[PDB]
Design an enzyme around this catalytic site. Structure first.
Site, short mmCIF file in Angstrom:
data_model
loop_
_atom_site.label_atom_id
_atom_site.label_comp_id
_atom_site.label_asym_id
_atom_site.label_seq_id
_atom_site.Cartn_x
_atom_site.Cartn_y
_atom_site.Cartn_z
N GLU A 1 -3.13 -12.88 7.60
CA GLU A 1 -4.02 -12.29 6.61
C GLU A 1 -3.66 -12.92 5.27
OE1 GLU A 1 -4.16 -8.06 6.44
OE2 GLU A 1 -4.44 -7.77 8.60
N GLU B 1 1.71 -4.76 9.77
CA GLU B 1 2.75 -4.42 8.80
C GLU B 1 3.59 -3.24 9.28
OE1 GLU B 1 0.75 -3.88 4.93
OE2 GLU B 1 1.13 -6.02 4.64
#
Ligand SMILES: *[C@@H]1O[C@H](CO)[C@@H](O[C@@H]2O[C@H](CO)[C@@H](O)[C@H](O)[C@H]2NC(C)=O)[C@H](O)[C@H]1NC(C)=O
Ligand SMILES: *[C@@H]1O[C@H](CO)[C@@H](O[C@@H]2O[C@H](CO)[C@@H](O)[C@H](O)[C@H]2NC(C)=O)[C@H](O)[C@H]1NC(C)=O
Ligand SMILES: *[C@@H]1O[C@H](CO)[C@@H](O[C@@H]2O[C@H](CO)[C@@H](O)[C@H](O)[C@H]2NC(C)=O)[C@H](O)[C@H]1NC(C)=O
Ligand SMILES: *[C@@H]1O[C@H](CO)[C@@H](O[C@@H]2O[C@H](CO)[C@@H](O)[C@H](O)[C@H]2NC(C)=O)[C@H](O)[C@H]1NC(C)=O
Ligand code: NAG
Ligand code: NAG
Ligand code: NAG
Ligand code: NAG
Ligand code: NAG
Ligand code: NAG
Ligand code: NAG
Ligand code: NAG
Lengths: 600, 600
Positions: B241, B161
């Site tokens: 994820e 991220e």
């Protein structure tokens, strides 16, 4: 600080180091449970609050052949006693020589029957000599384990319901007692156990030997101990086998006794201040040929769960906690958490494959060589104390039309025979059930009969349990000579592996278990859906007999000790009646591993 | 037979040895689970039908101090990868250097903060140098494990991220990518993971590096993969994820997501043919100081159960079987029984006893010696990367009347301080909750402040997480000089043992486990009824932080590897707030071992 244990006649009790004492014991057979798990059960026994155990020494477990003794590892009873002592448990030793116990031939070695008319549990000179020799071997091992020598052995049983035996020999008991005193010393405390009725004590008790009874919940407790007191006016009241459950028989429904009924009775017994042993506390397992039998013939199954406080696989049951709660009334119970019920694992379905019938592998099964005899010989006569025996002859007459296999001179086929001719299975025969069977084959054809020892009777008079053909085998009342018998070395054969009823045949399957799993392997239960009856080994360890189609036992206990990770697991099944393995469906030719037992 | 794995842009997939391929993976952190149990979880992962794993390499786990590397035994990541390969599982490696992962400081070593103004995850020359050195150490270990060199490593994550970080540095990403290509070779497949919104990919993606997103059940799947395709027009769709559950925070209620909702979403994702990794598949454990933090400050608890398909202790949950069932739609699942949930054992109540406060044992705690400074130093400034730090000064004014401990120049006490004077506990202080406290003592009295690192923030901008006193400590806006700090060697101290809020003190208790029980020791869960907050070790292994009074976590996972039979088990508790151990009731001064976890 000297250890002075002796019966206190004045105060009707025991005295241990000068202190009043009464014991609350449970039976555990080190031999019906693998040594790998001994500690476990014994620790659970300690955690239940028992301060002593009551165990049998099966003579046949240590001397399978005359003069051959096994006492190491799984055979190391002395180590078992030492372990119990290390746990702080006392020991009540019951060395027989007859133990009953739903155990093969009451512990007596089958080779005693090499004298055909010999008498067991009597003054028979050869019996007494063999007993004496066994005692002279066993008892010096127990001597250092006696309480007065610093071990856990506090009392010793000389017999088991001797009043139920026909002989009523008091010379025999006197001979045993003299030999026990001689080898063990006058210090030992010696006792008997009999059914709770004076009629049995009549023939069971003996001077210079303490007398006790056994009884369960269906006996007047007052009357039972009155019966004991009629033979022991002074000393502790003792029930050596207060039955918490009961034995099973194949086909007979599994016996179940309500937990809390046993609990109430136990409390009643304890309130009198008596000494009680819970038979059984753990039942354990009926290995390959260790089962016994009653009369009329009814063999006990592989499971010896017994409805005991500890289940066959050692699980903590509601009965266990109930009995712990009851016992904690009369003694402080050990501190700390109790060892748990073992983990169980469902390995699932494992397939097998037809390997070979017994007939087609006798050389591998009997590498020393076969036996020849004019008339058939019994299991004992052929020097095979367990297992199965192959009887072979030639047909003296043409049997193109079905001729009757029928009576022998005195109905002496025991206990089960699978009949075939040149690998053509013909059906079954058994005692009290099926003794007649039509067969077919040409004159001179090889007739093979596979005879199974379903268990030597362990209780009653009928200890002269021949096992197989003894008398002149007859077909349609026609004699048969020129017999070849084949003893089968099933154990070494399985351990080596050469490295529409289906004929008795071997089906070998494999299964693997992953390595590196801390909690694998685990104990398990094997089921045989679609199979009928036979014997099973894993990695050469004979787990015992299965018979789902007869029941009530379905699953077989598999202790985790016998499974080896990375190395292939090699299950061998000897099926005697039927296998789901002829057609093209392989899924049916599988056994299963399950986690939760199903025995009733 | 050459192993040719590469992305197939034409057909939007992977190609493995020329065959179309897409992976169905689960995350497993070898470091949040003890090595003793690695195989177990991985085998369960195989039995779930996953063909790859997605794991992080926490830099701080292998290099606690600059230039000091640990890679053996529990530290042997390479062995973990090799084991996965041996099980037939592929590996997606995510070596960071930042991993987030609710793990301390996102994997970055705290000693990086020795440069006060240094910037992490940027083009800071010292950061880039340290990253480069770490890569030059780690990546050559991974090189032989790459798929094209015959190992299980098929793809490699470069960030996590990155679009959520303030820097938006593409020079930084380019520098990482150049170094990864240099050490690992052009053959490797490199990918990124970001939140499923183009705004994050804006700053996360990079040329010559594949781009992927993550998202859970609360995202439009179509929109998410459209967002990915806007950055990767060709190639496999990938959710690195897909959240099956969620993280927890102390005090915040345990997050729970319905099983079958996750199952339905997973089926939807699979039906598009994408590549999905289930984060987490097993969560494992937050050891001593491995937890992270968010902003506004909220540390993650010891339990990392995550509501994962495998529970913290590895139990098969309804979620596990549901996900196996879903996955079996799109691939054959391995044959054979699945390794079970581990056995659990209730060891019961174990008592403790006040040993000594930190203050009264600093020499034993800090045998090298203490630190002195004009003004207070931070946890990093005192070269203690974890643990707790003792701050000592002298009171410059009489405080017979309660004087206010209050603000510092910029509100820089983090994250919790237990305040006392000469062994008189005064109460607590924490960030955003309590920064003012009245205290009492004579002028010149020794003031001791015990500062706890509750976890370095692992997500967001606030990575400059000092931990403790940085600024001039002030009481009632009055400065304080002449400070003595004490780093605490809690690990070696526990492993050696010198061989009304209660002051932070150590309570040591023992428990024994019987030997010779095949299924003992077992995994367990420790509970602290009546305790408030602290740290716990067993046999020197730091199990992590407990905080029942805050919750939602109550029990702590105890892996059976750390228990030793016969040898005494020696539990040490460092309690920071309150112990039930002053009065005459000893039963209250006990912790408990339980079998079934209670975490929500
Ligand atoms: C089996 O048959 C043989 C046939 O000879 C029997 O042997 C004779 O049996 C009679 C009694 O039936 C005796 O009087 C003879 O002395 C026996 N002779 C020999 C040479 O043994 C034998 O007893 C039969 N056995 C059984 C068990 O039926
Ligand atoms: C179960 O069968 C397997 C398959 O052969 C056995 O594994 C081999 O056993 C032989 C012993 O005769 C060894 O020489 C080999 O080295 C074993 N194989 C390997 C790969 O090592 C296994 O021993 C059998 N188990 C039992 C208890 O008999
Ligand atoms: C703590 O107090 C000291 C007092 O000397 C501060 O040191 C001075 O701080 C000023 C700014 O406030 C600077 O202009 C001086 O150059 C500093 N002098 C020295 C010798 O350092 C110090 O900055 C304060 N620190 C904190 C974190 O409050
Ligand atoms: C837990 O405490 C026990 C009690 O001292 C330790 O047992 C002894 O440990 C010392 C090591 O310092 C050995 O020298 C002794 O031989 C041990 N006692 C016996 C009877 O052998 C035990 O080692 C401690 N466990 C841990 C992990 O520290
Ligand atoms: C047992 O018998 C005695 C006398 O024979 C009697 O007093 C008692 O009530 C009986 N108890 C039970 C439980 O049968
Ligand atoms: C059995 O033997 C008898 C001899 O009396 C004979 O009559 C009969 O036919 C035989 N049985 C068969 C099936 O042949
Ligand atoms: C049985 O064995 C004897 C031994 O010599 C032999 O004489 C006889 O012919 C045999 N009978 C049969 C039917 O094989
Ligand atoms: C077990 O036997 C089967 C029989 O076909 C074989 O396919 C399988 O490979 C064997 N297991 C192992 C682990 O070799
Ligand atoms: C997702 O968004 C697309 C277009 O933005 C729409 O067609 C689709 O129905 C949406 N699906 C869900 C589950 O929100
Ligand atoms: C704190 O300092 C101020 C200085 O302005 C003083 O007036 C006050 O009394 C102090 N607090 C206490 C509790 O003495
Ligand atoms: C602090 O340390 C310096 C170092 O010499 C010393 O001069 C000063 O007196 C100390 N102050 C206090 C309050 O201890
Ligand atoms: C554990 O510590 C207690 C503390 O009094 C002690 O009594 C006990 O003996 C110890 N356990 C063992 C096994 O020594």
């Amino acid at each position: 600080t000297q250890r002075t244990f002796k019966l206190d006649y004045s105060r009707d009790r025991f005295l241990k180091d000068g202190q009043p004492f009464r014991y609350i014991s449970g039976s555990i057979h080190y031999f019906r449970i693998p040594r790998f798990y001994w500690e476990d059960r014994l620790l659970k026994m300690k955690m239940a609050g028992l301060n002593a155990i009551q165990m049998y020494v099966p003579w046949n477990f240590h001397e399978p052949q005359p003069g051959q003794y096994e006492f190491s590892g799984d055979r190391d009873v002395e180590h078992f006693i030492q372990l119990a002592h290390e746990l702080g448990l006392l020991v009540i030793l019951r060395p027989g020589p007859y133990i009953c116990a739903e155990w093969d031939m009451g512990g007596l070695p089958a080779w005693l029957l090499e004298k055909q008319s010999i008498v067991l549990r009597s003054s028979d000179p050869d019996y007494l000599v063999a007993v004496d020799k066994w005692l002279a071997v066993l008892l010096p091992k127990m001597k250092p384990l006696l309480y007065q020598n610093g071990g856990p052995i506090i009392t010793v049983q000389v017999e088991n319901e001797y009043g139920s035996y026909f002989a009523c020999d008091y010379d025999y008991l006197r001979f045993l007692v003299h030999r026990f005193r001689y080898h063990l010393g006058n210090d030992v405390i010696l006792f008997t156990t009999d059914g709770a009725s004076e009629k049995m004590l009549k023939c069971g008790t003996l001077q210079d030997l303490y007398a006790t009874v056994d009884f369960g919940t269906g006996n007047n407790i007052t009357q039972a101990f009155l019966v004991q007191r009629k033979f022991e006016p002074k000393g502790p009241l003792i029930n050596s086998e207060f039955y918490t459950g009961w034995l099973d028989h194949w086909g007979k429904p599994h016996s179940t006794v309500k937990t809390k009924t046993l609990a109430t009775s136990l409390y009643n017994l304890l309130a009198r201040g008596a000494n009680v042993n819970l038979y059984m506390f753990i039942g354990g397992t009926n290995f390959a040929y260790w089962n016994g039998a009653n009369t009329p013939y009814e063999p006990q199954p592989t499971s010896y769960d017994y409805d005991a406080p500890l289940s066959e696989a050692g699980d903590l049951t509601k009965k266990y906690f109930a009995l712990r709660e009851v016992i904690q009334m009369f003694k402080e119970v050990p501190e700390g958490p109790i060892p748990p019920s073992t983990p169980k694992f469902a390995y699932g379905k494992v397939a097998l494959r037809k390997f070979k019938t017994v007939a087609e592998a006798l050389g591998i099964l009997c590498p020393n060589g076969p036996v020849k005899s004019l008339y058939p010989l019994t299991f004992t006569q052929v020097k095979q104390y367990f297992g199965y025996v192959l009887y072979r002859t030639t047909l003296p007459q043409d049997c193109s039309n079905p001729k009757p296999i029928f009576s022998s001179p005195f109905n002496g086929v025991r206990d089960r025979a699978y009949v075939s001719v040149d690998g053509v299975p013909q059906g079954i025969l058994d005692r009290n059930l099926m003794t007649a069977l039509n067969i077919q084959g040409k004159a001179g054809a090889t007739l093979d009969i596979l005879v199974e020892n379903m268990g030597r009777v362990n209780y009653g008079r009928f200890i002269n349990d021949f096992k197989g053909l003894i008398s002149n085998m007859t077909i349609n009342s026609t004699v048969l000579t020129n017999w070849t018998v084949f003893p089968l070395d099933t154990e070494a054969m399985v351990r080596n592996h050469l490295w529409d009823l289906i004929l008795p045949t071997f089906y070998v399957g494999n299964f693997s278990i992953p390595s590196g799993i801390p909690d694998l392997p685990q104990d398990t239960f094997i089921q045989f859906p679609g199979w009928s009856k036979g014997q099973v080994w894993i990695n050469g360890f004979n787990l015992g007999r299965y018979w789902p189609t007869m029941g009530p036992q379905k699953t077989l206990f598999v202790p985790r000790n016998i499974l080896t990770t990375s190395a292939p697991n090699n299950i061998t099944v000897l099926e005697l009646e039927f296998a789901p393995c002829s057609e093209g469906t392989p899924e049916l030719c599988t056994v299963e591993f399950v986690d939760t037992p199903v025995i009733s």
